[PDB]
Amino acid sequence: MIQRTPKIQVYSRHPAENGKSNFLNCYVSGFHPSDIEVDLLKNGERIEKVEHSDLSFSKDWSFYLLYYTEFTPTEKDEYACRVNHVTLSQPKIVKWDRDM
């Protein structure tokens, strides 16, 4: 059985300006098989309704998905993405790095 492990990027749709409304993104890709949990965190708490694109996959047959949510960044707020997959021993949390 082929298993491929998620590659994860946490970033904003537009360049983050505090106080200015944006979208926070979590792009999970290159994984296989397709079963995957993804949540978006604000200060460690699940953000109630994030939306996501419909599972597609790329030429090597690995899957990809985009998880996103409207948000307004500040300085004290910490944002992160949390990803669970059979290739992971426990949920992997990638924190949003504003200049990355």
């Binding site: 694109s53 599972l55 597609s56």
Partner: protein
């Protein structure tokens, strides 16, 4: 650049799932325009681009038709998950994945170049259609029994040829016109260089591009004329979530050397590439 119309079908079996689940997306170029999930309340193909909601007013049964095709494709893949299990002599109960992508491509001038129809079992190439011969390449060795099934019935290759080189071509042209405003746009990138000092004391310059469409882009860090395959890190191109893409290219150096380096950024949308210094 190129144009294309592609469908992506994914079916997965599980202990979590009573019957295996079937999912489908369709793309015109790099934009997704339809989707389908066997596990909705009433599974139905649904629009996901604004320009495809047009389709019904000069093709009223469009959504009904697709839906029936995808309900029947749902059972085709469930059956197929069971058949292939046998081919690979596997226990029941497992997690298994069966995938298929198919579609067609045109030149910038809208002429057919290539069709394809390809499948994978459990993330591995299984069988695929050779477009120039319209025979079946069995990549997995136990896909040869599928290969003999499908070659014993000429209407399968015949139906793909008619679909790939005519039906697909004509629907793609129509979609392109229907989606003139969005699918015809070519969007150049905006670009920016950022400066970062690392805890050891060295300097990272990051050449950032965003808001571009299509997703193909060349990011090059030139140290006084010469590419820097050395300390150059890339990130994979990523969707902004609004139709466009983002990519950045980093590079490392000793404080004082910034002025040597340059970032060239070329993309279908830019007259001339972008030269950016810090």
């Amino acid at each position: 650049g190129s144009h294309s119309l592609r469908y992506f079908y994914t079916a997965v079996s599980g202990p979590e799932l009573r019957e295996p689940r079937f999912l489908s997306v369709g793309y015109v170029d790099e934009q997704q325009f339809v989707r389908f999930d066997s596990a909705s309340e009433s599974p139905r193909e649904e629009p996901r681009a604004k320009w495809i909601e047009r389709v019904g007013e000069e093709d009223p049964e469009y959504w009904e038709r697709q839906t029936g095709i995808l309900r029947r494709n749902t059972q085709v893949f469930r059956v197929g998950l069971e058949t292939l299990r046998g081919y690979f002599n596997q226990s029941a109960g497992g997690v298994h994945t069966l995938q298929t992508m198919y579609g067609c491509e045109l030149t910038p001038e809208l002429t057919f170049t290539r069709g394809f129809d390809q499948s994978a079992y459990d993330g591995r190439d299984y069988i695929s259609l050779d477009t120039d011969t319209y025979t079946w390449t069995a990549t997995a060795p136990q896909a040869v029994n599928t290969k003999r099934k499908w070659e014993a019935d000429r209407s399968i290759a015949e139906g793909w040829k008619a679909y790939l080189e005519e039906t697909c071509v004509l629907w793609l042209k129509k979609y392109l016109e229907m989606g003139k405003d969005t699918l015809g746009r070519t969007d150049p990138p905006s670009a920016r260089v950022t400066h970062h000092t690392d805890p050891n004391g060295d300097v990272t310059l990051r050449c950032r591009a965003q808001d571009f469409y299509p997703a193909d882009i060349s990011l090059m860090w030139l140290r006084d004329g010469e590419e820097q395959l050395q300390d150059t890190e890339f990130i994979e191109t990523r969707p902004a979530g609004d139709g466009t893409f983002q990519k950045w290219a980093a590079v490392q150096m000793t404080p004082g050397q910034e002025g040597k380096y340059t970032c060239r950024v070329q993309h279908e949308g830019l007259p001339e590439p972008l030269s950016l210094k810090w």
